[PDB]
Enzyme design. Structure first.
Site, PDB file in Angstrom:
ATOM      1  N   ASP A 289       0.949  -1.189  -0.038  1.00 37.76           N
ATOM      2  CA  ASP A 289       0.092   0.007  -0.024  1.00 37.76           C
ATOM      3  C   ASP A 289       1.012   1.118  -0.047  1.00 37.76           C
ATOM      4  OD1 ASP A 289      -2.258   1.527   0.192  1.00 37.76           O
ATOM      5  OD2 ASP A 289      -2.614   0.747   2.273  1.00 37.76           O
ATOM      6  N   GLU A 495     -10.619   6.027   4.846  1.00 40.72           N
ATOM      7  CA  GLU A 495      -9.658   5.660   5.698  1.00 40.72           C
ATOM      8  C   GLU A 495      -9.518   6.361   7.089  1.00 40.72           C
ATOM      9  OE1 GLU A 495      -5.746   4.688   3.508  1.00 40.72           O
ATOM     10  OE2 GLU A 495      -6.884   5.571   1.903  1.00 40.72           O
TER      11      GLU A 495
END
Ligand SMILES: *[C@@H]1O[C@H](CO)[C@@H](O)[C@H](O)[C@H]1NC(C)=O
Ligand SMILES: *[C@@H]1O[C@H](CO)[C@@H](O)[C@H](O)[C@H]1NC(C)=O
Ligand SMILES: *[C@@H]1O[C@H](CO)[C@@H](O)[C@H](O)[C@H]1NC(C)=O
Ligand SMILES: OC[C@H]1O[C@@H](O)[C@H](F)[C@@H](O)[C@@H]1O
Ligand SMILES: OC[C@H]1O[C@H](O)[C@H](F)[C@@H](O)[C@@H]1O
Length: 606
Positions: A289, A495
């Site tokens: 990521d 997020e």
């Protein structure tokens, strides 16, 4: 096999493995590490791509050539970058990735599908396959070959900011919805070996099972934090859908920022090499990521040398840098030149990257197809998102007493109706995060139909539709209304911004529901990415619908409100009574839900 300047890796008739080996045997260290490097379009130039032999590009959330750009503008941007990569000595095409996680959602005019939580409410894996299919077309409309999806997190606490990106707190629902994979990539042939990557060709995209592993298990739902659970519970809850993904040929796997019992996933050899690769037999590529290797250390980025070493030795193949490519490349080069990372490790990464590229057809079709541009936002895809939005809705209440006339379905003919609330006419709010911007946004951000617009499109021509965002109680009592539709809920988030310990909707929300419902019979449409404190909204309301984040096609909402279709959605998560109960899942001992997993009232079509 034939001309004097023949090169086996460039021969489309040869087996992928022979092409992989042929190309790998020609490559320098620099060309190899280049394949392993993915950079943001924001830092990419033709010289940067050529000189550093770059393997991949991405758009992060909101990383676009310009606001409002057409499908063709995206194709031309991607083709620009490709042309530079194709001009290297070996002419290895780049792969371009993007978060297309509920449609091609960074793109203006792309069909925006319900987020994952709502798809879980559908219990319809075929519908999710079809959404895969349509998303692949809309991604390839923009010249992009790779989608960072599905998120197969099993969200175990709705305080997590990414709970809406999980189909369910129940892994079996998550497992059933890995059908997104063959929709995006194509169905694997009957012979297929589980763990091999697959993409059918130029009209499909590579997919990405993410984020490996236990991303939905973190303490108090804190994003990217520690998941504390023994191996048996990791393997029983968080892992199973990864094996479904291998069985369907998922091309890539992205690693989580999260830790498992204190070990950073991005530095976990046992899990990434020992388990994913050596036990599940995954043969596609493993990607980090965004600055996920930087975050191995605390503080993040304080020993980038170690970040590189630990990640690459753990088994990661491709690094989403995404900005400091020069440093990444130099550090990894130094580690290999010093014997700290063996060539066998580099060669395994590059073999996997190349395997996916060749398998998917990228050397044969490196460039965009301009005839695909008109797939963006196509009506047949809007119709599908509308069906998905309608199927996702969960009817929680439809009458205050068991003896009241059921409010839903509402009649299309009435002299005057009220549509109210902060979410009734706000396309951005109804799409949520990962829509145009990373965090999503407010207002008319893209092409679509708000709840208000859908009402006005649905009703009888004699029905007068009044909109007021936040009417007071007198306004409603004086208005001569037959009924009201009031929509309220969460603002967009993505997020760690979405991590929320109280799970109470912003005001005004409840106050408008109270004002409206106190004057006239009301159906409340709750827009959220997760269960939220709902008893006050329930007590005010004649009917209430959990519509989740249903996307661009607000007519899915009114399709069920006005009884064109019955309500069928079922809760894919537990609805809690209080946040002090959390975490609380179908299964625990203290299991005391407001609405259990699987709950949902029904209606019949009129
Ligand atoms: C979890 O969050 C806490 C509190 O913010 C932080 O100190 C800790 O380092 C985080 N742990 C992990 C493993 O990310
Ligand atoms: C609960 O948490 C959110 C997001 O973390 C915060 O913005 C909000 O103001 C909180 N609500 C209350 C009522 O304290
Ligand atoms: C809807 O149809 C079902 C299936 O036959 C029926 O039993 C149910 O009670 C119906 N409800 C209403 C309000 O028409
Ligand atoms: O944290 C900053 C960045 O983080 C990623 O996870 C997003 F995709 C980006 O586009 C965003 O701006
Ligand atoms: O934006 C690129 C990637 O950034 C990191 C995120 F966790 C992941 O879900 C995303 O795909």
């Amino acid at each position: 096999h034939h001309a004097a300047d023949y090169v086996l890796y460039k021969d489309a008739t040869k087996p992928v493995e022979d092409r992989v080996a042929d190309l790998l045997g020609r490559m320098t260290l620099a060309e190899k590490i280049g394949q392993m490097t993915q950079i943001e379009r924001l830092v990419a130039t033709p010289d940067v791509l050529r000189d550093n032999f770059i393997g991949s590009l991405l758009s992060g959330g909101g990383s676009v050539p310009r606001k409002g750009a057409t499908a063709k503008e995206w194709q031309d941007m991607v083709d620009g970058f490709q042309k530079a990569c194709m001009s290297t000595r070996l002419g290895i095409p780049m792969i371009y990735g993007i978060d297309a996680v509920h449609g091609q959602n960074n793109v203006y005019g792309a069909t925006i599908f319900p987020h994952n939580v709502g798809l879980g409410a559908t219990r319809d894996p075929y519908l999710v396959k079809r959404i895969g299919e349509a998303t692949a077309l809309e991604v390839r409309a923009t010249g992009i070959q790779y989608a960072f999806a599905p998120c197969i997190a099993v969200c175990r606490d709705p305080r997590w900011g990414r709970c809406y990106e999980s189909y369910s707190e129940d892994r079996r629902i998550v497992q059933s919805m890995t059908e997104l994979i063959p929709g995006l990539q194509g169905d694997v042939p009957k012979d297929f070996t589980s763990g091999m990557p697959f993409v059918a060709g130029k009209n499909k995209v590579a997919a990405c099972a993410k984020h490996f592993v236990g991303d939905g298990g973190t303490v108090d739902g804190i994003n990217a934090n520690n998941t504390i659970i023994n191996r048996e519970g990791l393997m029983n809850i968080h892992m199973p859908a990864y094996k479904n993904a291998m069985d369907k040929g998922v091309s890539t796997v992205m690693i989580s920022y999260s830790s498992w019992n204190g070990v950073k996933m991005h530095a976990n050899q046992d899990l990434v090499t020992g388990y994913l690769k050596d036990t599940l037999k995954f043969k596609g590529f493993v990607i980090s990521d965004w600055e996920g290797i930087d975050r191995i250390t605390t503080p993040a980025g304080s020993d980038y040398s170690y970040s590189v070493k630990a990640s690459i030795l753990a088994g990661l193949d491709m690094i989403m840098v995404p900005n400091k490519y020069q440093q990444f490349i130099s550090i990894l080069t130094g580690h290999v030149n010093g014997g700290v990372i063996p060539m066998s490790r580099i060669d395994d990464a590059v073999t996997r990257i190349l395997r996916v590229k060749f398998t998917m057809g990228l050397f044969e079709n490196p460039y965009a197809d301009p005839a695909m541009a008109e797939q963006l936002g196509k009506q047949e895809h809007r119709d599908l998102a509308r069906e998905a939005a309608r199927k996702s809705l969960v009817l929680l209440k439809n009458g205050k007493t068991s003896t009241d006339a059921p409010l839903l379905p509402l009649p299309k003919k009435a002299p005057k109706i009220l549509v109210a609330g902060s979410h009734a006419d706000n396309l951005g709010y109804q799409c949520g995060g990962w829509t145009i911007e990373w965090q999503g946004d407010t207002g008319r951000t893209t092409v679509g139909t708000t709840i208000l617009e859908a009402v006005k499109a649905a009703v009888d021509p004699s029905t007068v539709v009044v909109f007021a965002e936040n009417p007071d109680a007198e306004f409603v009592k004086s208005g001569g209304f037959s009924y009201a539709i009031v929509a309220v809920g969460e603002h967009p988030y993505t997020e760690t911004k979405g991590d929320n310990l109280n799970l109470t909707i912003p005001e005004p929300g409840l106050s408008t529901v109270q004002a409206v419902c106190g004057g006239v019979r009301c159906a409340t449409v709750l827009i959220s990415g997760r269960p939220v404190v709902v008893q006050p909204l329930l007590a005010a309301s004649d009917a209430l619908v959990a519509a989740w984040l249903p996307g661009s096609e607000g007519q899915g909402v009114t399709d069920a409100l006005f009884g064109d279709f019955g309500f069928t959605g079922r809760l894919p998560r537990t609805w809690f009574k209080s946040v002090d109960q959390l975490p609380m899942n179908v299964g625990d001992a203290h299991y005391d839900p407001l609405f259990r997993l699987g709950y949902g009232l029904t209606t019949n079509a009129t």
